């Protein structure tokens, strides 16, 4: 077949194991995120690089919670950073992680996702470290795959995963390359971003529900292009505008 | 069924229609981009907000082609931006697209993919018409059901498909919203960073095999921590750093 359809059934059949293996641990995630906005906590994401992506995707965003913030780490937002070499080494500045976080409105009881594909790295198990020091409850996005065939960078030698409260399992087979060409020596087209952004609307998703389900209206955003949008938007700033640092 | 299931298999059938509704498309576009590159030319990518995230998705990317850039618009590189309602606002400033365009080193004969759900704002409605005008050929990565059910924001009133070379759609309905429950009022869960990746990925791809199958050892970059891999991705920067913008 085509590299395009074998691509995107590669992508398929790795949703298909997110849906199938991770149910059970996507309903826990959810259920953290809404117990940390039940119990008055603030939510963050974070993620270097392309794992930024997803948690980028989960903030400010329609029909996503207005409560989701981004933790930003200078340099590693994206690729977008000059040179882009620069954001991979990045990922390995022991003590980057502490700077952001203490600097942070972050606190004990509040709750932060760490996307990291391989969670070998310093920069997101130490995230993931100090993070649990702080007191938060940690929510890690990471192919656990990569624990068990790769050897940490983090001087610990653990991973992001021995770090984590609940770990989501993104099943990225070690190299992130789904596709083999005869023609070209190396694999390629990664799926990570797909698996990863997928992964975290249906956490998201959950928490919006379970709040539901408990008879808390889920601060969802809305369209501004809906009529009554706006005005929903307005009410759930001036209702939870103490944990939203997106906006003021 | 639990909402991370529900949503997990919306974004599976999305996928699906990609494949089996734009393989032609891809392909096509697939070409443009090996026939950009085998002619000399450059490679851009373009997103505003959430949009971006596809966008950055294929640059600096272990199992990407190295000659793909980020054409950057300040306040619209994901939602890395204070506060983050401006990014929605900069998508109306007419003229920020020809700004940045001007300033680029983009010329006639490169080849500049746009992604936009809608289609139907200034900047991005901008971007490809005056990319055009500057003789670049125009990817557009766009829900196309956007422009039969809505109008556009643009003074033209038209909306990104038409001023495309080739159009790419990512099927998502209106409202990027694919989750509905009883208890909330207002649609929520959107998939469309989710497709639009994998749409990107998949054309990347593509661009990587058609320029093997012409003899052409594609550019793609490795990863560091394979045996080779910085080796390789020094030759290519040395073989292809006058069309390579993000590192030097």
Redesign the interface.
Same mark, same amino acid.
């Given at each position: 077949h085509?590299?395009?359809?074998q691509?995107?059934?590669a992508?398929?059949d790795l949703?298909?194991r997110?849906?199938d293996e991770?149910?059970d641990s996507?309903?826990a995630a959810?259920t953290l995120l809404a117990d940390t906005v039940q119990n008055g906590g603030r939510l963050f994401a974070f993620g270097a690089g392309?794992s930024?992506?997803?948690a980028?995707?989960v903030?400010?965003?329609?029909?996503?919670l207005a409560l989701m913030n981004?933790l930003?780490v200078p340099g590693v937002?994206?690729?977008?950073v000059?040179?882009? &070499?620069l954001?991979?080494a990045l990922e390995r500045v022991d003590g980057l992680a502490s700077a952001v976080l203490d600097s942070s409105p972050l606190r004990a009881g509040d709750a932060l996702v760490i996307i990291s594909l391989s969670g070998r790295n310093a920069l997101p198990v130490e995230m993931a470290m100090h993070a649990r020091a702080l007191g938060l409850r940690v929510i890690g996005v990471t192919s656990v795959a990569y624990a068990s065939q790769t050897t940490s960078r983090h001087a610990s030698g653990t991973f992001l995963k021995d770090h984590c409260d609940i770990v989501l399992d993104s099943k990225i087979a070690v190299?992130?390359?789904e596709?083999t060409?005869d &023609?070209?020596p190396?694999?390629?087209?990664?799926?990570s971003?797909?698996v990863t952004?997928?992964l975290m609307?249906?956490? &998201?998703? &959950?928490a919006?529900?379970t709040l539901?389900?408990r008879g808390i209206e889920?601060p969802?955003l809305?369209?501004?292009n809906?009529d009554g949008g706006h005005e929903?938007n307005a009410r759930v700033l001036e209702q939870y505008g103490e944990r939203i640092f997106?906006?003021?």
């Amino acid at each position: 077949h085509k590299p395009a359809g074998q691509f995107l059934d590669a992508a398929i059949d790795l949703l298909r194991r997110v849906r199938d293996e991770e149910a059970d641990s996507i309903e826990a995630a959810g259920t953290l995120l809404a117990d940390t906005v039940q119990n008055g906590g603030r939510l963050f994401a974070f993620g270097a690089g392309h794992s930024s992506l997803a948690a980028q995707d989960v903030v400010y965003r329609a029909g996503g919670l207005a409560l989701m913030n981004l933790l930003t780490v200078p340099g590693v937002v994206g690729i977008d950073v000059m040179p882009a &070499t620069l954001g991979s080494a990045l990922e390995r500045v022991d003590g980057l992680a502490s700077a952001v976080l203490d600097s942070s409105p972050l606190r004990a009881g509040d709750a932060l996702v760490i996307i990291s594909l391989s969670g070998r790295n310093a920069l997101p198990v130490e995230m993931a470290m100090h993070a649990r020091a702080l007191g938060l409850r940690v929510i890690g996005v990471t192919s656990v795959a990569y624990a068990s065939q790769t050897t940490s960078r983090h001087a610990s030698g653990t991973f992001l995963k021995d770090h984590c409260d609940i770990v989501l399992d993104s099943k990225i087979a070690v190299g992130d390359a789904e596709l083999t060409l005869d &023609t070209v020596p190396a694999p390629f087209a990664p799926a990570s971003t797909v698996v990863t952004a997928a992964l975290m609307q249906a956490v &998201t998703a &959950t928490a919006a529900a379970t709040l539901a389900d408990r008879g808390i209206e889920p601060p969802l955003l809305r369209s501004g292009n809906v009529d009554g949008g706006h005005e929903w938007n307005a009410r759930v700033l001036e209702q939870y505008g103490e944990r939203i640092f997106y906006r003021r």
